[PDB]
Design a protein around this ligand. Structure first.
Ligand code: PBE
Length: 309
């Protein structure tokens, strides 16, 4: 009769990106149905998350990105210290965008065109002549990807990687876009930005001149027709402490089979951004998703409970 997680405490970890909370708590709810006591997530830098997971201070994360986290994953112990099975979120996109108005006028389709200082000046916001790319916070996996690519594409003389607080910077970028000025930024899905600036209407994605990712000399981000946006279709995974997973087969199975559509996280993140972003609202987003997918959610729980436990 007794549920397998009775008496066992779970510590989730995510980053300080509040938009990660929904998917983290979805896993927490599932573990609670398996009987576990789940604490509120710790919100720490990704790299701190991975070392905590490897030591056993943290139990799971649900925001492990491939390939952007590969270097942090391997560095912290890789498959020797971590359990990682299945695919939690498929079909994420990332890349570089400029406003469609500017792209159409000057016929800009490739980031390599920003080597021309005249083109780059269009996107200068601080007057130093260089294009100002709204980029990634220190510690994000995309920090390393963007730095690597600007160097590889010979863009460091005309393009600046602006770093700080991405969410605040993007509000300024949207404000500038609304004044009718050119903008240049990196983003990903799922996140709230793509709801405000939509490709084909407001903005366009830029291609890159060849494949370049840090730590993999033979990376190939090309699509079958030869078009390249600089990043592959990306996925998120649930990652757990390996030793904990070996002792908790019901949880291990649950982690391998849970799946959340990228569109659902996009929708939740958009609602948060329109003002409903308190802890209490996010809990209700999670509870409402479950009620709307009750058969699926219960199926995951039933499969986990039927593991050899
Ligand atoms: C901030 N991010 C959510 C953007 C894509 C993956 C991740 C990161 O760069 O690590």
């Amino acid at each position: 009769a007794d549920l397998p997680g009775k008496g066992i405490t779970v510590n989730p970890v995510q980053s300080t990106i509040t938009e990660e909370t929904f998917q983290t708590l979805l896993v927490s709810r599932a573990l609670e149905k398996l009987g576990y006591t789940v604490n509120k997530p710790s919100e720490v830098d990704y790299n701190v998350g991975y070392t905590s997971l490897a030591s056993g201070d943290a139990t799971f994360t649900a925001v492990n990105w491939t390939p952007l986290h590969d270097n942090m994953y391997e560095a912290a112990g890789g498959d020797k210290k971590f359990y990682r099975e299945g695919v939690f979120v498929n079909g994420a996109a990332q890349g570089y965008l400029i406003d469609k108005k500017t792209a159409d006028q000057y016929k800009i389709t490739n980031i390599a065109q920003l080597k021309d200082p005249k083109i780059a000046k269009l996107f200068d916001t601080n007057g130093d002549g260089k294009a100002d790319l709204t980029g990634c916070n220190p510690g994000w996996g995309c920090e390393g990807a963007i730095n690597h690519q600007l160097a590889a594409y010979e863009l460091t003389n005309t393009v600046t990687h602006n770093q700080g607080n991405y969410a605040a910077m993007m509000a300024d970028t949207i404000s500038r876009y609304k004044e009718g000025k050119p903008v240049f930024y990196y983003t990903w899905t799922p996140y709230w930005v793509s709801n405000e600036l939509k490709p084909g209407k407001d903005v366009v994605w830029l291609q890159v001149p060849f494949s370049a990712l840090p730590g993999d000399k033979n990376a190939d981000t090309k699509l079958p027709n030869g078009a390249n946006y600089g990043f592959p279709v990306s996925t998120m995974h649930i990652v757990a402490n390996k030793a904990w997973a070996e002792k908790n087969p019901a949880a291990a199975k649950l982690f391998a089979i849970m799946q959340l559509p990228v569109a659902d996280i996009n929708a939740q993140n958009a609602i948060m951004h329109d003002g409903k972003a308190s802890e209490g609202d996010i809990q209700g987003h999670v509870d409402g998703w479950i009620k709307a997918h009750q058969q699926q959610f219960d199926g995951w729980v039933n499969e986990a409970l039927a593991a050899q436990k």
